[PDB]
Design a protein around this nucleic acid. Structure first.
Lengths: 79, 158, 924
RNA sequence: UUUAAAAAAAA
């Protein structure tokens, strides 16, 4: 799991599960995105994404890094 | 359960290759402009995530009596502009963000081709005699079913 | 007492034809055929079938026991043809309902003068031939339907099913009650004790009965073993039968090396099969979930050509068209179609019956090339395959988990290898880590299990027998192939006791009085030592002394491992387990996955392994604590420990010192003091005896011990022989009759009262409960829905943990039923009958009460199927059983002349009988 | 620039 996990930080407010899943599924099969919400009811700058295979995790990073989502770069880190 | 194939609805469903207008809005770029990732994507190559999906592994088991891996060529993903020629109306915007024109290796064709006992009357005394129930007749369904597959692999081998 | 002679008729090679006939009779040869043969076959008949046909030509019963697919059914076909040719009537009996349907379809397409009678349906009852499940035949016998008069032949099928332990009794009853003029034909899988069955039939009906036994099979078999972790299949058994020991050992060694160290093994196996051209495969897994998961895993292959896909789509659509369009929208029907399209199918009790029938048809026609099935599919008819695969060799029967018996393995593997099309059947057995070479050898080399009856009394049987006149249950108990086995066994025990007695007399003793006194004193000393040791092993006294270096001797009765060093101890759950370091046998070590332990054989050198013994096995807790290496993993250290023990023994030439139970362990309670006094007195008495100092007393003592052993053996053997001289359940019958009379069913003179007469009808579920509730007026107020739900609660039995909450109408009636059941349990208990009240009450599981209530209300099937977790197959089974029980309840209400209940149950039947649950089988 | 394993079956 930890191998297939990948943290996402500094994501735009409207960035929800559906859009992130759409973005990340095209490169390869992705299990799902986890967004444990704070005491606010809105997506946080912090979240995680779990992919079907860890081999796919780097390529997404190789393809996506601070991409212009909603006119706002989004950073991605490892475990 | 076998029929409980609802795991594919955690939040929705999508398809590979195609680009949704909602995704275009999310990325901040409309459909007229070529996707920026494609640049980097064609500077990276074919994603390995779907490569495993199209790859079938031959079992190595051998009979201890006293690899040319198989790939499903029909499952190849479509990535126009990298593997397939860019659709008309979309110029080769390799000068944006830095990239090169779609290469033959980057193209789909090259990658694809690269690979004593009481009498009976006494018994019926004092108890209701047995009666037939649920009387019915054959509906012929088995006959028609058999007629359908008249020439089956078993039959043709007979 | 039985008196039957078994004449071994000579026969050609391949079969062993022997006839059991009454002792006073004189065997005579079987006359050849007279006139034209009943029916002609297009192929030559193997010898045993020819002998069976000749035997039936003389109107003499026969018991064919041969591997399924050896061609047993030809004998039944010939018998039916002969019976029809003579204007007689015949009955064909099968255990299961679905197997009965398939057999009926075959016969109808054969002769077209066929009927069918089962609980679900009945077709052409007035036919010269009939097919019916055993229960219908038993009902005919008990009620003596006139149709039974015309019969002349009865063909029992799968008679080896008689040991079902739940539905076995229904066979014996049916066999007992038939008139003697009838002639039987029994078809069974190969079993060792067929001769006993033939003798029973002969003794029971006073006529000759033959036995044809043949193990021949048309196409040979090859057995491979796949270890969990290996990378290949080992040819453990070849068609010649020469169990290849070396290959089996290599496979098990690979298993061990992997254990002590294509994501799924089954996927690798099936893929290898596919690429090796063994396409038609049956994968047996003893769990519904396992079959579902394995089928799901394989949703990435395709064994079918496009034309096969079109054909499968056509067949599936045509089969499903019968159901209502709303039914076709069920997830189950929709989601299986892709699997059949790609050539993968599932078959287990959970599925819907219609899907099971469709999959059976497709497999029979070859469209499906890999079928995941449970044990049930094994009993199917004419559905062979070129290969069979076992996922897990562990099944949970009614009792608990266990290794599949060799009989079941043979039965299932018999479904491998078609006739002619493929000339080499392949059977592959997967073995996990929890497997032992001994278990594997026994499973592969084992033979079919013996046929042991399971007769047990039932209130319905007792009531019905009492009702009829000129007969009593004692007759049944006497003749029910259970006293028969004991009678057959009696000569063995008689000869055993006689032989032991003559040998005991043969022994010669110089002067038995003095030797016996000495031996008795010795035994008393042994008992006192046992008491002292029991005193030592109290945990609070010996646990402080079981340090990780202590030197203790462990001696389980009969087998003593010698000295060994303690390593650790713990409280297992409240016994204590002490882990000693003993010398093992290197055989129990290799198959340690299942064996316990064994002392090292004196000839060879053990392995010096850690054994977890029980605390009380410590014969003597010496006091020489060794210096333990502190790391006993490597095998080198433990040999050093063995050398150290040998050195310590060499240092104390006259026995290692033992902890003194009195002062070293500081035991104070006076009981040990008195035991010490007793042992001291006995020791002095023994020493003062003269023969103790005499020479050569060792041999005399040994022979005296052997004489005592033989004496106790004689005592036990004759005691059990006297025990066997009485009918067993007679006490059980007495208890049952007491209970029946105590509730008014039977008068003190054992004549059926109206209550028992009513209870006679109900036979699909409990009778006393239903009759009591009916008489107590419980049902007089419930609407049809509540009655239906309660009856459903009666006929449900499955390991369900849901325990759903019932709101208003399904609770109160359940509580009243609980009260009545408690009353019945208490009455049974006070009548000295073995019954656990809590378990009895726990039997009636109401888990489906709400489901059945909703279904009666008018809910669509999909709605209820989502209302719980039980597989839809179980729901359908329970619904059918409830429907038949409701019909029986209608009959009972008619009997008591209470129109209200009759109308109520009519409403119940009308409401809960509709499209999908009671979907007519497509085999009709 | 990072939250419990569990088969089969009927009047």
């Amino acid at each position: 799991e930890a191998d297939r996990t990948l943290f996402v930080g500094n994501l735009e407010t409207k960035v929800t599960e559906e859009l992130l899943f759409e973005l990340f599924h095209q490169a390869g099969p992705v299990i799902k995105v986890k967004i444990p919400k704070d005491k606010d009811g809105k997506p946080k700058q912090f979240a995680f994404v779990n992919f079907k295979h860890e081999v796919s995790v780097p390529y997404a990073m190789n393809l996506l890094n601070g991409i212009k989502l909603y006119g706002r770069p989004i950073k991605i880190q490892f475990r | 359960r076998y029929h409980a194939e609802e795991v594919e609805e955690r939040f929705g469903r999508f398809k590979p290759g195609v680009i949704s207008e909602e995704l275009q809005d999310a990325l901040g770029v409309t459909d007229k402009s070529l996707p920026p990732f494609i640049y980097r994507m064609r500077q990276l190559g074919y994603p390995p995530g779907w490569l495993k999906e199209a790859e079938l592994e031959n079992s190595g088991l051998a009979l201890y009596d006293g690899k040319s891996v198989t790939y499903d060529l029909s499952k190849l993903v479509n990535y126009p502009g990298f593997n397939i020629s860019t659709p008309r109306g979309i110029p080769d915007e390799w000068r944006i963000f830095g990239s090169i024109p779609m290469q033959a290796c980057q193209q789909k064709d090259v990658f694809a081709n690269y690979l004593p006992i009481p009498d009976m009357s006494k018994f019926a005394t004092g108890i209701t005699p047995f009666e037939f129930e649920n009387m019915a007749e054959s509906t012929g369904m088995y006959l028609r079913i058999r007629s359908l597959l008249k020439n089956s692999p078993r039959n043709q081998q007979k | 007492m039985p008196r039957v002679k078994v004449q071994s008729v000579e026969t050609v090679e391949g079969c062993t034809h022997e006839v059991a006939l009454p002792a006073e009779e004189d065997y005579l040869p079987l006359k050849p055929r007279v006139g034209k043969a009943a029916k002609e076959y297009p192929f030559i008949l193997d010898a045993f079938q020819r002998e069976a046909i000749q035997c039936v030509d003389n109107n003499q019963s026969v018991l064919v026991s041969a591997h399924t697919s050896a061609g047993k059914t030809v004998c039944a076909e010939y018998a039916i043809a002969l019976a029809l040719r003579e204007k007689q009537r015949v009955i064909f009996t099968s255990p299961i309902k679905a197997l009965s349907n398939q057999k009926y379809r075959e016969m109808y397409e054969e002769f077209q003068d066929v009927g069918l009678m089962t609980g679900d349906v009945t077709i052409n009852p007035t036919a010269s031939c009939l097919v019916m499940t055993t229960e219908i035949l038993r009902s005919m016998l008990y009620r003596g339907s006139e149709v039974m008069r015309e019969v002349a032949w009865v063909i029992f099928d799968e008679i080896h099913y008689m040991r079902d332990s739940e539905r076995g009794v229904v066979w014996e009853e049916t066999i007992i009650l038939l008139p003697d003029n009838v002639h039987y034909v029994f078809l069974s899988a190969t079993i060792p004790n067929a001769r006993q069955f033939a003798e029973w039939i002969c003794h029971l009906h006073k006529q000759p009965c033959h036995v044809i036994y043949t193990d021949y099979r048309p196409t040979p078999l090859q057995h491979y073993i796949f270890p969990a972790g290996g990378d290949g299949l080992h040819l453990v058994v070849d068609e010649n039968g020469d169990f290849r020991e070396d290959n089996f050992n290599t496979a098990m060694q690979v298993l061990r090396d992997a254990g002590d160290l294509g994501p799924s093994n089954v996927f690798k196996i099936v893929k290898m099969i596919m690429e090796r051209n063994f396409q038609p495969v049956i994968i047996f897994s003893f769990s519904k979930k396992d079959c579902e998961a394995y089928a799901l895993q394989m949703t990435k292959l395709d064994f079918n050509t496009d034309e096969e896909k079109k054909m499968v789509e056509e067949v599936f659509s045509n089969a499903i068209d019968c159901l209502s369009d709303e039914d076709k929208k069920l997830p189950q029907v929709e989601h299986v179609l892709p699997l059949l399209k790609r050539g993968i199918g599932i078959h287990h009790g959970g599925l819907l019956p219609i899907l099971k029938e469709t999959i059976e048809i497709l497999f029979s026609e070859g469209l499906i090339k890999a079928l995941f099935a449970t044990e049930t599919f094994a009993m199917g008819i004419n559905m062979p395959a070129r290969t069979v695969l076992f996922t897990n060799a562990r099944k949970f029967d009614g009792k608990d988990f266990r290794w599949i018996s060799s009989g079941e393995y043979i039965q299932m593997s018999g479904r491998a290898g078609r006739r002619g099309m493929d000339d080499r059947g392949i059977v592959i057995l997967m073995v996990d880590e929890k497997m032992s070479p001994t278990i594997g050898k026994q499973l592969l080399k084992g033979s079919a299990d013996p046929l042991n009856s399971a007769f047990h009394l039932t209130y319905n049987m007792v009531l019905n027998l009492l009702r009829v006149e000129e007969i009593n249950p004692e007759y049944m108990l006497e003749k029910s192939f259970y006293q028969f086995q004991h009678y057959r066994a009696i000569p063995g025990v008689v000869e055993k006791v006689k032989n032991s007695e003559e040998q005991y007399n043969k022994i010669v003793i110089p002067n038995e009085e003095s030797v016996v006194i000495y031996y008795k004193i010795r035994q008393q000393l042994a008992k006192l030592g046992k008491e002292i040791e029991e005193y030592i092993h109290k945990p609070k006294y010996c646990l402080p002394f079981l340090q990780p270096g202590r030197l203790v001797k462990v001696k389980n009765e009969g087998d003593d491992f010698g000295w060994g060093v303690v390593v650790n101890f713990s409280k297992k759950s409240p016994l204590y387990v002490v882990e000693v370091l003993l010398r093992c046998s290197k055989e129990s070590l290799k198959n340690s996955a299942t064996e316990a332990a064994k002392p090292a054989k004196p000839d060879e050198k053990g392995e010096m392994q850690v054994v977890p013994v029980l605390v009380h096995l410590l014969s003597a807790i010496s006091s020489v604590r060794l210096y333990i290496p502190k790391d006993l993993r490597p095998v080198d250290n433990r040999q050093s420990v063995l050398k150290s023990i040998q050195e310590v023994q060499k240092r104390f030439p006259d026995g290692i010192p033992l902890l003194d139970p009195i002062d070293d362990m500081g035991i104070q309670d006076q009981g040990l003091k008195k035991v010490i006094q007793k042992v001291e007195a006995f020791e002095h008495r023994m020493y003062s005896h003269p023969l103790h100092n005499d020479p050569n007393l060792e041999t005399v003592y040994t022979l005296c011990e052997k004489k005592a052993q033989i004496a106790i053996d004689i005592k036990s053997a004759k005691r059990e022989l006297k025990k066997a001289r009485t009918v067993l359940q007679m006490d059980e019958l007495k208890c049952r009759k007491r209970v029946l009379r105590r509730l008014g069913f039977a008068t003190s003179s054992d004549v059926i009262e109206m209550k028992g007469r009513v209870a006679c009808e109900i036979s699909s579920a409990d009778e006393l409960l239903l009759t009591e509730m009916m008489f107590n007026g419980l049902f007089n107020d419930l609407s049809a829905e509540q009655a239906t739900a309660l009856l459903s609660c009666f006929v449900f039995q499955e390991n369900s943990s849901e325990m759903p909450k019932l709101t208003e109408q399904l609770a109160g009636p359940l509580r009243q039923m609980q009260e009545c059941a408690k009353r019945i349990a208490k009455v049974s208990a006070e009548a000295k009958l073995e019954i656990d009240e809590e378990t009895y009450l726990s039997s009636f599981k109401p888990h489906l009460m709400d489901v059945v209530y909703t279904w009666a209300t008018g809910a669509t099937f999909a709605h209820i199927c989502k209302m719980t977790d039980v597989f839809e197959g179980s729901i359908i089974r329970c619904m059918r059983r409830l429907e038949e029980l409701l019909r029986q309840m209608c009959q009972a209400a008619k009997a008591i002349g209470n129109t209200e209940l009759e109308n109520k149950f009519a409403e119940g039947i009308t409401k809960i009988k509709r499209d999908i649950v009671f979907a007519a089988s497509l085999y009709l």
